[PDB]
Amino acid sequence: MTHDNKLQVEAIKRGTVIDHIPAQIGFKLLSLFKLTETDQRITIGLNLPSGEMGRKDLIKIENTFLSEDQVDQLALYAPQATVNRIDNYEVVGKSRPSLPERIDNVLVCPNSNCISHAEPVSSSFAVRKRANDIALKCKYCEKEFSHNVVLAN
């Protein structure tokens, strides 16, 4: 770990340090994944300068480790974020976000007639990477849309 905190962002003992989150996205992450709802000491750096990305974001979530899965879901938002396993002052394993078969709860359905919109039903979408984009198909209407569309609204 280079950890050049001459002034910017901490470093901890145990935990997970989601890094190289691109621009504004980080907030989205915390929001979508509710990484703020824990007793734990999260510590966020926003718009943290990095000439290699211009400005990036960092979420350090002390004494907390994300599963291969919890990591996977970040593929749509921060595809190139290196999740880090930290349990004794230094890196014990980095992680590259890999596209996952499904994306539950976080998304919404582009098709308004989807019964999903009114009932206590957590969204669920199968992911299919088809050239120049990613297709997402609702567990419900079974209607397939471009992730660009699923993300816009």
Partner 1 sequence: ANPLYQKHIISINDLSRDDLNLVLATAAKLKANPQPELLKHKVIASCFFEASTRTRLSFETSMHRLGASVVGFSDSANTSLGKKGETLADTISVISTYVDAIVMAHPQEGAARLATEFSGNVPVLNAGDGSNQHPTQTLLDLFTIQETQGRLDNLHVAMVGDLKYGRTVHSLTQALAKFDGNRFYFIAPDALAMPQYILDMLDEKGIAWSLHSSIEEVMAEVDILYMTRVQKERLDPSEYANVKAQFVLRASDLHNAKANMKVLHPLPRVDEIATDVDKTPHAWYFQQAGNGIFARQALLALVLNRDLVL
Annotated binding site for Zn(2+): 109, 114, 138, 141
> Would you count residue 125 as binding partner 1 (CB under 8 A)?
no
Site track 45-74 with its own copies (rule: CB under 8 A), x = hit: xxxxx-----x-------------------
Dig out the tokens for 95 from the structure.
Answer: 């992680």
If binding is defined by CB under 6 A, does position 84 make contact with ligand PAL? yes
Tell me if residue 35 falls in helix, strand or coil.
coil
The residues near 141 (Cβ < 8 Å, ≥ 6 apart) are 109, 111, 113, 114, 115, 116
Cα separation, 24 vs 121, in Å, equals: 28
**Of 25-33, 73-81, 96-104, 109-117, which part binds its own copies (CB under 8 A)?**
25-33
Judged by CB under 6 A, which of 10, 91, 102, 105 binds ligand PAL?
91
Name the one range near its own copies by CB under 8 A: 3-11, 66-74, 100-108, 125-133: 3-11
**Does 49 help bind ligand PAL (rule: CB under 6 A)?**
no
**H or E element that contains 72:** helix 68-72
- C-alpha Rg value of the chain to the nearest Å: 17
Closest-CA residue to 71 (of 124, 123, 19): 19
Of 29-48, binders to its own copies (CB under 8 A) are 30-31, 36-48
Residues that bind partner 1 (CB under 8 A): 110-116, 118-121, 138-146, 148-149, 152-153
